[PDB]
Write a protein that binds this ligand. Structure first.
Ligand SMILES: O=C1c2ccc(O)c(O)c2C(=O)c2c(O)ccc(O)c21
Length: 332
């Protein structure tokens, strides 16, 4: 037989209750602006499939960000604009300000309001125990909002979280892999970035949901508290799952496979072996122990589960004891 089906435990049917227009992005009609409204200042970096520049809107002297898109299918560009439009103004979501083409090259680009940050490569090292709870909290607000709106991000990782540490603000960026959740849909598993891929993607289970983003969050949490970036460091997709199996063990992994009747690629037979599930204390040492607490480990353990159904939802994650003091500090 084939694989056993699966549904999200929350927000299962929110797209069904919307007008078709909200999620039927193939039919979205885009009005394209003129890129001559913007003068590029400097190259800032790259998205998953784009080049990103600092620019100035000359009509109002406003600082913006210009993301010039690499040639991708026309419906994927529609998908990202529609998702950005649907999510605009929500907590911690990057704000799309305009859409343009370079009049000469025809090439499409998205214009975001400017947000300044400190690179994660520099930042993580400086973070206090409190700071990790704080920003994790802020991330979880962006995830619960997008999940509640019918949308999985599908590329959660440190590069995609811009933190203005000076002002204690954060934005979730790069929505070019995000999709609408619909019960029963079978999604492409070639998404996310290797170290942050859920076991669902690695074993080729196509009927996944919001809970994918929560695995990615847990990978991030693990790198921050153990001071090890990235936490699961595989060389390719297969070895990514060997490295998880040596932490979480092989017993739950095979129970996982049995439950959903997943056909394992024969290539996994000899490399996976047989591994016990390890106690988190193994990763604690003198450089990181100030960030590790019984509260941190309980939370972490409830994110990193093979069985996607059994991971915390964003909203549950926000009710965890690990966040009690940030909740108290906030409101107010
Ligand atoms: O603001 C974005 C930004 C805003 C929205 C995006 O979708 C995005 O990919 C980026 C982005 O990749 C980026 C970057 O790679 C380097 C510096 C940045 O300021 C950004």
């Amino acid at each position: 037989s084939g694989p056993v089906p699966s549904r999200a435990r929350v927000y299962t049917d929110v797209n069904t209750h919307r007008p078709r227009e909200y999620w039927d992005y193939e039919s979205h009609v885009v009005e394209w602006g003129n890129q001559d409204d913007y003068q590029l200042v400097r190259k800032l970096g790259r998205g998953k499939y784009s080049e990103v520049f600092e620019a100035i809107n000359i009509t109002n002297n406003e600082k913006v960000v210009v993301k010039i898109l690499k040639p991708v299918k026309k419906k994927k560009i529609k998908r990202e604009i529609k998702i950005l439009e649907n999510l605009r103004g929500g907590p911690n979501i990057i704000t799309l300000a305009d859409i343009v083409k370079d009049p000469v090259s025809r090439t499409p680009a998205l214009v975001f309001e400017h947000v300044n940050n400190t690179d994660f490569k520099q930042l993580y090292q400086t973070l206090t125990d409190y700071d990790i709870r704080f920003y994790m909290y802020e991330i979880l607000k962006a995830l619960d909002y997008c999940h509640s709106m019918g949308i999985m991000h599908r590329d959660v990782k440190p590069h995609n979280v811009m933190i203005d540490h000076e002002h204690r603000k954060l934005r979730l960026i790069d929505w070019g892999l995000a999709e609408f959740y619909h019960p029963g849909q079978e999604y492409n598993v070639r998404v996310a970035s290797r170290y942050f891929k859920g076991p669902e993607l690695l074993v080729d289970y196509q009927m996944y949901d919001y809970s994918l983003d929560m695995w990615s969050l847990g990978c991030m949490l693990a790198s921050m508290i153990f001071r090890k970036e990235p936490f699961f460091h595989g060389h390719d997709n297969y070895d990514q799952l060997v490295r998880i199996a040596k932490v979480l063990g092989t017993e739950d992994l095979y129970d996982y496979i049995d439950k959903y009747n997943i056909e394992l690629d024969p290539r996994f037979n000899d490399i996976l072996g047989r591994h016990s599930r390890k106690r988190w204390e193994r990763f604690v040492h003198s450089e990181n122990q100030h960030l590790v607490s019984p509260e941190a480990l309980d939370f972490l353990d409830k994110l990193l589960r093979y069985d996607h159904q059994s991971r915390l939802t964003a909203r549950e994650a926000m009710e965890h004891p690990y966040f009690y003091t940030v909740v108290k500090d906030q409101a107010r």
